[PDB]
């Protein structure tokens, strides 16, 4: 946990502010960090000669159905209450996957 | 001799593994007096079995295993692999990524197939006397080089079989070399640049590094031979606008002028020498020395020789499709290797059949199993001075 | 100028005073900024560049007279600061790569000062084994030396030594056929073998500071 | 035979007082009422499952050695039928060898072995 030492002190201009979107599922994802690859006994991360882990595979999973959501919403000519369902379902998916690194 | 038959092959195969394979001297020489914990334990056999179904991680624990494993199965080709940190049998009960090879030989495999574009006797997938030669070539060329630049002391060549032979360097340095150094090694020893289908694929600096100028040495020494009365690379129009394509266009006239009146290759050849000599004398590029380094010098894969970890051909195993012997070279009598003389698997079978299981003695595998046997000998020795003094 | 030619290993133990410690690290990033500003400025083969550096390292107190044994004023001071240092530039890769390249700079200063005599000792000394051949071997096999060497001019095979090495620690030279090699050895002049001792330097010194970033917090 | 559909909300399982069962609750559509109406479903014979990892050569655990007889799953399941299953009084079972991954914080564990699975009844301790 990093923390960037705070510039104290009252800004004229704009401020931009700028979030990662889930630093660390994106980590697991890039990385390939899971329990089957990972040698350990801070260990060393694995070349990426190796294939997905059951981990990064069930994040790519999390995003491909946030992806087949994000394209049935926009469909037109849909259900009014059925664009509710498919924002819940975004949300969900979300916290799915941010929460991901919590276990 | 006598045609093989490849549909006799597995029927002589069993009776070949089971009454000649030499398991005793296998056995000692991948086993190096198991001065180390588990060198054979851990040393990865492949076999490439009926149906061409191909198995990779095959380990043994001992000779007998081995026998066992071997003779239950008669497997139709045989290849050795390296030395793995956990038995290749139990590669999948290790975690992804612990099982890894450390060591192996240094393999030098030298190939027929790389002569397309220079020679002119056979096709590329056949061999004859008259271009067998250009094998030696290599042999008193690499072999020296381990020896003499590098200082390998233990080298075993062995003929692959059909179309060229392979080097098996041994040493207790060598086996623990990195893949880098491996590369640089083949890289250092390799001269022809083989591009995309370039006439020129050899180029010389005023520098001439001394292995360059010993091994045209020892090319001269056998120039005459092959590449100029056995071979006729300067016997024709064809044949010799490919020879013109190296030297510069300003001297592609005078040379095919000089060609024209000859009749034999040899005079062609030493007004060539002269015209060469003439041109660098004016201007070298050792014009002379580039067509030799060109046509006789050796083609090594970068490929084979820098992976730790490849597989290739066992000595002492058969070839399907002609069915001879993966038998050692006598570096003693080099030029007196003779692929015609190597027996057949089916002729050594029928030796056998019409006859302390020392039955090698009796077929013509013993001139071999005694080179073998030598080679081990002087692992034994070696081991003993490093070890015990 | 003294014996403080040294590849950077084996962290001291000893204890000292706060004063002390950020006078070292003061004076280290001092010296390796006039290093970058003379590298940028000059060049690495004029005498305004050696006078320079070296009398921003006389100014420092980084080579200066001896004591007994144990407390070498200079040599406390550079090995310390160095290991201060350390632990400033191991956090960002940029940081790592600046103090990588400034520190191999004056490691490059101190060899080229040097005289053609106690370089061996260091070579020899330095790690495990290093070994140089004698006047009887040179001359011996000097033409295949001169032939086997690089596009350097003529066959002055002169007063320079050549040192005999592992083959396979002058990879990066044998692998293009610019040495010669005799039973597995390759015989080097100077200027290769300064490059060889920049590259293992560079590869410790980077292979230490990634380590060292993994126990910072 | 029978077969009807409901659609389950919440469960309940008892370990310290009904062990092998569990209490499915949610909705069933019933026609007489035009409406769903809540129900429970109970399903029992939950069998507890264990996996025992055989060893790769029989040792004296007394002493802590080997005995120089590699070990088979013959040996487990002798082991466990004899020495096991009598001691914490187990009367039935059903035993079988099934091959299982495994790459988690254990110890000493193959990432792929043999194991032997044995299912008993929940009410044996
Ligand atoms: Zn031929």
Same mark, same amino acid.
């Given at each position: 946990?990093?923390?960037?030492?705070?510039?104290?002190?009252?800004?004229?201009?704009?401020?931009?502010?700028?979030?990662?979107?889930?630093?660390?599922?994106?980590?697991?994802?890039?990385?390939?960090? #899971?329990?089957?690859?990972?040698?350990?006994?801070?260990?060393?991360?694995?070349?990426?000669?190796?294939?997905?882990?059951?981990?990064?595979?069930?994040?790519?999973?999390?995003?491909?159905?946030?992806?087949?959501?994000?394209?049935?919403?926009?469909?037109?000519?849909?259900?009014?209450?059925?664009?509710?369902?498919?924002?819940?379902?975004?949300?969900?998916?979300?916290?799915?996957?941010?929460?991901?690194?919590?276990? | 001799?006598?045609?093989?038959?490849?549909?006799?092959?597995?029927?002589?195969?069993?009776?070949?593994?089971?009454?000649?394979?030499?398991?005793?001297?296998?056995?000692?020489?991948?086993?190096?007096?198991?001065?180390?914990?588990?060198?054979?334990?851990?040393?990865?056999?492949?076999?490439?079995?009926?149906?061409?179904?191909?198995?990779?991680?095959?380990?043994?624990?001992?000779?007998?295993?081995?026998?066992?494993?071997?003779?239950?199965?008669?497997?139709?080709?045989?290849?050795?692999?390296?030395?793995?940190?956990?038995?290749?049998?139990?590669?999948?009960?290790?975690?992804?990524?612990?099982?890894?090879?450390?060591?192996?030989?240094?393999?030098?495999?030298?190939?027929?197939?790389?002569?397309?574009?220079?020679?002119?006797?056979?096709?590329?997938?056949?061999? #004859?006397?008259?271009?067998?030669?250009?094998?030696?070539?290599?042999?008193?060329?690499?072999?020296?080089?381990?020896?003499?630049?590098?200082?390998?002391?233990?080298?075993?060549?062995?003929?692959?079989?059909?179309?060229?032979?392979?080097?098996?360097?041994?040493?207790?340095?060598?086996?623990?070399?990195?893949?880098?150094?491996?590369?640089?090694?083949?890289?250092?020893?390799?001269?022809?640049?083989?591009?995309?289908?370039?006439?020129?694929?050899?180029?010389?600096?005023?520098?001439?590094?001394?292995?360059?100028?010993?091994?045209?040495?020892?090319?001269?020494?056998?120039?005459?031979?092959?590449?100029?009365?056995?071979?006729?690379?300067?016997?024709?129009?064809?044949?010799?606008?490919?020879?013109?394509?190296?030297?510069?266009?300003?001297?592609?006239?005078?040379?095919?002028?000089?060609?024209?009146?000859?009749?034999?290759?040899?005079?062609?050849?030493?007004?060539?020498?002269?015209?060469?000599?003439?041109?660098?004398?004016?201007?070298?590029?050792?014009?002379?020395?580039?067509?030799?380094?060109?046509?006789?010098?050796?083609?090594?894969?970068?490929?084979?020789?820098?992976?730790?970890?490849?597989?290739?051909?066992?000595?002492?195993?058969?070839?399907?499709?002609?069915?001879?012997?993966?038998?050692?070279?006598?570096?003693?009598?080099?030029?007196?290797?003779?692929?015609?003389?190597?027996?057949?698997?089916?002729?050594?079978?029928?030796?056998?059949?019409?006859?302390?299981?020392?039955?090698?003695?009796?077929?013509?595998?013993?001139?071999?199993?005694?080179?073998?046997?030598?080679?081990?000998?002087?692992?034994?020795?070696?081991?003993?001075?490093?070890?015990?003094? | 100028?003294?014996?403080?030619?040294?590849?950077?290993?084996?962290?001291?133990?000893?204890?000292?005073?706060?004063?002390?410690?950020?006078?070292?690290?003061?004076?280290?990033?001092?010296?390796?900024?006039?290093?970058?500003?003379?590298?940028?400025?000059?060049?690495?083969?004029?005498?305004?560049?050696?006078?320079?550096?070296?009398?921003?390292?006389?100014?420092?107190?980084?080579?200066?007279?001896?004591?007994?044994?144990?407390?070498?004023?200079?040599?406390?001071?550079?090995?310390?600061?160095?290991?201060?240092?350390?632990?400033?530039? #191991?956090?960002?890769?940029?940081?790592?790569?600046?103090?990588?390249?400034?520190?191999?700079?004056?490691?490059?200063?101190?060899?080229?000062?040097?005289?053609?005599?106690?370089?061996?000792?260091?070579?020899?000394?330095?790690?495990?084994?290093?070994?140089?051949?004698?006047?009887?071997?040179?001359?011996?096999?000097?033409?295949?030396?001169?032939?086997?060497?690089?596009?350097?001019?003529?066959?002055?095979?002169?007063?320079?030594?050549?040192?005999?090495?592992?083959?396979?620690?002058?990879?990066?030279?044998?692998?293009?056929?610019?040495?010669?090699?005799?039973?597995?050895?390759?015989?080097?002049?100077?200027?290769?073998?300064?490059?060889?001792?920049?590259?293992?330097?560079?590869?410790?010194?980077?292979?230490?500071?990634?380590?060292?970033?993994?126990?910072?917090? | 035979?029978?077969?009807?559909?409901?659609?389950?909300?919440?469960?309940?399982?008892?370990?310290?007082?009904?062990?092998?069962?569990?209490?499915?609750?949610?909705?069933?559509?019933?026609?007489?009422?035009?409406?769903?109406?809540?129900?429970?479903?109970?399903?029992?014979?939950?069998?507890?499952?264990?996996?025992?990892?055989?060893?790769?050569?029989?040792?004296?655990?007394?002493?802590?050695?080997?005995?120089?007889?590699?070990?088979?799953?013959?040996?487990?399941?002798?082991?466990?039928?004899?020495?096991?299953?009598?001691?914490?009084?187990?009367?039935?079972?059903?035993?079988?060898?099934?091959?299982?991954?495994?790459?988690?914080?254990?110890?000493?564990?193959?990432?792929?072995?043999?194991?032997?699975?044995?299912?008993?009844?929940?009410?044996?301790?």
């Amino acid at each position: 946990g990093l923390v960037l030492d705070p510039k104290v002190g009252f800004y004229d201009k704009f401020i931009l502010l700028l979030d990662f979107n889930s630093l660390y599922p994106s980590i697991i994802q890039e990385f390939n960090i #899971c329990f089957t690859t990972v040698q350990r006994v801070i260990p060393e991360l694995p070349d990426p000669s190796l294939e997905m882990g059951i981990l990064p595979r069930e994040i790519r999973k999390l995003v491909e159905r946030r992806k087949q959501v994000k394209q049935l919403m926009k469909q037109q000519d849909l259900n009014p209450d059925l664009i509710l369902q498919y924002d819940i379902r975004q949300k969900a998916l979300k916290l799915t996957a941010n929460s991901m690194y919590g276990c | 001799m006598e045609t093989f038959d490849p549909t006799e092959l597995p029927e002589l195969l069993k009776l070949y593994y089971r009454r000649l394979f030499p398991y005793s001297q296998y056995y000692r020489w991948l086993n190096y007096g198991g001065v180390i914990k588990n060198y054979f334990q851990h040393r990865e056999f492949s076999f490439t079995l009926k149906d061409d179904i191909y198995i990779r991680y095959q380990s043994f624990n001992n000779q007998s295993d081995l026998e066992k494993e071997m003779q239950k199965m008669n497997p139709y080709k045989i290849d050795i692999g390296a030395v793995y940190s956990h038995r290749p049998n139990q590669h999948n009960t290790v975690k992804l990524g612990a099982f890894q090879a450390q060591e192996k030989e240094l393999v030098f495999d030298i190939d027929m197939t790389d002569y397309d574009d220079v020679r002119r006797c056979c096709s590329s997938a056949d061999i #004859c006397p008259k271009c067998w030669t250009l094998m030696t070539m290599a042999i008193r060329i690499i072999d020296r080089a381990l020896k003499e630049d590098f200082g390998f002391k233990h080298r075993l060549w062995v003929y692959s079989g059909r179309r060229g032979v392979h080097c098996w360097v041994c040493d207790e340095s060598v086996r623990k070399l990195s893949s880098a150094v491996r590369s640089g090694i083949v890289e250092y020893l390799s001269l022809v640049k083989g591009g995309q289908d370039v006439k020129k694929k050899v180029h010389l600096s005023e520098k001439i590094h001394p292995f360059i100028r010993k091994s045209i040495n020892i090319i001269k020494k056998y120039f005459e031979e092959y590449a100029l009365v056995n071979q006729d690379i300067l016997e024709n129009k064809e044949s010799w606008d490919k020879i013109l394509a190296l030297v510069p266009e300003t001297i592609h006239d005078e040379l095919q002028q000089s060609f024209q009146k000859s009749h034999n290759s040899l005079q062609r050849w030493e007004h060539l020498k002269k015209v060469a000599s003439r041109y660098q004398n004016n201007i070298g590029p050792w014009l002379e020395w580039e067509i030799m380094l060109q046509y006789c010098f050796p083609r090594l894969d970068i490929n084979v020789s820098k992976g730790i970890n490849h597989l290739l051909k066992s000595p002492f195993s058969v070839h399907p499709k002609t069915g001879r012997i993966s038998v050692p070279i006598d570096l003693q009598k080099v030029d007196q290797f003779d692929p015609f003389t190597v027996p057949t698997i089916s002729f050594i079978c029928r030796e056998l059949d019409a006859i302390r299981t020392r039955d090698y003695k009796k077929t013509s595998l013993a001139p071999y199993v005694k080179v073998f046997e030598h080679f081990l000998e002087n692992l034994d020795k070696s081991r003993k001075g490093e070890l015990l003094k | 100028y003294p014996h403080c030619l040294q590849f950077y290993l084996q962290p001291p133990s000893e204890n000292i005073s706060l004063i002390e410690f950020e006078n070292l690290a003061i004076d280290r990033v001092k010296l390796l900024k006039s290093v970058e500003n003379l590298g940028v400025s000059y060049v690495k083969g004029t005498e305004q560049y050696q006078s320079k550096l070296e009398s921003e390292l006389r100014k420092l107190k980084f080579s200066y007279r001896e004591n007994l044994e144990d407390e070498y004023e200079p040599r406390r001071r550079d090995h310390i600061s160095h290991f201060i240092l350390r632990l400033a530039y #191991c956090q960002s890769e940029e940081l790592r790569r600046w103090f990588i390249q400034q520190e191999m700079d004056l490691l490059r200063f101190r060899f080229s000062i040097l005289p053609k005599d106690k370089i061996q000792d260091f070579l020899k000394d330095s790690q495990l084994q290093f070994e140089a051949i004698s006047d009887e071997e040179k001359t011996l096999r000097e033409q295949e030396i001169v032939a086997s060497s690089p596009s350097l001019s003529g066959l002055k095979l002169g007063f320079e030594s050549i040192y005999k090495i592992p083959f396979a620690d002058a990879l990066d030279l044998f692998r293009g056929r610019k040495v010669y090699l005799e039973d597995g050895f390759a015989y080097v002049p100077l200027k290769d073998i300064v490059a060889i001792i920049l590259n293992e330097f560079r590869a410790k010194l980077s292979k230490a500071l990634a380590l060292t970033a993994r126990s910072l917090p | 035979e029978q077969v009807f559909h409901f659609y389950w909300l919440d469960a309940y399982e008892d370990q310290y007082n009904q062990p092998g069962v569990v209490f499915l609750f949610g909705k069933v559509w019933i026609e007489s009422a035009e409406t769903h109406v809540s129900c429970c479903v109970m399903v029992k014979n939950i069998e507890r499952t264990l996996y025992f990892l055989p060893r790769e050569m029989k040792i004296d655990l007394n002493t802590g050695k080997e005995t120089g007889t590699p070990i088979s799953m013959k040996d487990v399941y002798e082991e466990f039928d004899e020495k096991i299953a009598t001691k914490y009084k187990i009367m039935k079972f059903k035993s079988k060898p099934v091959e299982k991954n495994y790459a988690f914080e254990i110890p000493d564990v193959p990432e792929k072995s043999e194991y032997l699975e044995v299912k008993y009844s929940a009410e044996m301790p």
